[PDB]
Design a protein around this ligand. Structure first.
Ligand SMILES: Cc1cc2nc3c(=O)[nH]c(=O)nc-3n(C[C@H](O)[C@H](O)[C@H](O)COP(=O)(O)O)c2cc1C
Length: 179
């Protein structure tokens, strides 16, 4: 495929969303939703376009063994690609979180994921408005706007489809989609 779709998940929501995204694209436009659990750093570097999802766990951290995820995830995968350069590549990020139970850490993992690739020279697209969200602070917020799509299936499952469709429409030009 042309667009690499990757995600990290412990209870399956981020995965659900990922498959939802891939639901509207070709097996030539986008690859299947893949868990970083089984991705080779070699297989990940091949994509010049990336769509990445991640929830935020224990202590506003990325899912992984330190955050008590059942199996490995973003935390352990990042070190495998930290030596990779993303200059000239395009990335879009989407995070899930619970704004009610974690008003001061809503989507922090998204923030950390943002920096990883941003620090690598990647072109990042898909900033999202904070309107419609109840939270106090987020490390995923830069200049009063989310660095990637903000989702909450714990308290706002009702707006997921609406949010996801609009976000896709928003990033389409940057991913050479006809959308
Ligand atoms: C121990 C625990 C800690 C969490 N901490 C945060 C947090 O700091 N910030 C946040 O925005 N969401 C937090 N969440 C919410 C999850 O990220 C959210 O439920 C998500 O939908 C789970 O995604 P998953 O099914 O892909 O694992 C936390 C959830 C659990 C169980």
């Amino acid at each position: 495929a042309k667009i690499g779709l990757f995600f990290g998940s412990n209870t399956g929501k981020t995965r659900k969303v990922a498959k939802s995204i891939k639901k509207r694209f070709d097996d030539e436009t986008m690859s299947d939703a893949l868990n970083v659990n089984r991705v080779s750093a070699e297989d990940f570097a091949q994509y010049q376009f990336l769509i990445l999802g991640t929830p935020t766990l224990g202590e506003g951290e990325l899912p992984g063994l330190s955050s008590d995820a059942e199996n490995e995830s973003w935390e352990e995968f990042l070190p495998k690609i930290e030596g990779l350069d993303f200059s000239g590549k395009t990335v879009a990020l989407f995070g899930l979180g619970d704004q009610v139970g974690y008003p001061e850490n809503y989507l922090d993992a998204l923030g950390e994921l943002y920096s990883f690739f941003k620090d690598r020279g990647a072109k990042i697209v898909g900033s999202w408005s904070t309107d419609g969200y109840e939270f106090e602070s987020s490390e995923a917020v830069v200049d009063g706007k989310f660095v990637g799509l903000a989702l909450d299936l714990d308290n706002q499952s009702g707006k997921t489809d609406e949010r996801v469709a609009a976000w896709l429409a928003q990033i389409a030009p940057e991913f050479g989609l006809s959308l």
